[PDB]
């Protein structure tokens, strides 16, 4: 699958995603990073979060990060996320994909979608 493929979000990072039907809008080969941080906004920690990716956080450059590693997140998925302080619970070399979908729950289409790795999708 690449960038134009159709298909099937097979994953529940959030609601209103499993099952929804999706169209690829990126494809990266990077490492991707499960991650656990307290918000900058104050609110309630977030615990392992699918997922943050190489280039989404500060001065990472080419350098693989390793599981426990503190680092600040660059990535804004979520109110409370950009400039984080996070602790990486896992690092993975896979592909993942930007989509967009169709919100099961409200019906909502949702762009740029980061992110679902190809173990988190069907064609």
Do not use: C, F
């Not at 499960?34 to 906004?41: E, G």
């Not at 990472?60 to 503190?70: I, M, V």
């Amino acid at each position: 699958m690449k960038v134009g493929s159709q298909v099937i979000i097979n994953t529940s990072h959030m609601k209103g995603m499993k099952g929804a039907e999706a169209t690829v809008t990126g494809a990266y080969d990077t490492t991707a990073y499960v991650v656990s941080y307290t918000p900058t906004n104050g609110g309630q920690r977030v615990d392992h979060h699918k997922w943050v990716i190489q280039e989404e956080i500060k001065d990472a450059g080419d350098k693989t990060l390793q599981p426990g590693d503190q680092v600040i997140l660059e990535a804004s998925h979520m109110k409370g996320m950009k400039g984080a302080t996070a602790e990486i619970d896992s690092a993975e070399k896979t592909t993942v994909y930007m989509v967009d979908y169709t919100s099961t729950t409200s019906g909502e289409k949702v762009k740029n979608h980061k992110w679902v790795t190809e173990d988190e999708l069907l064609e």
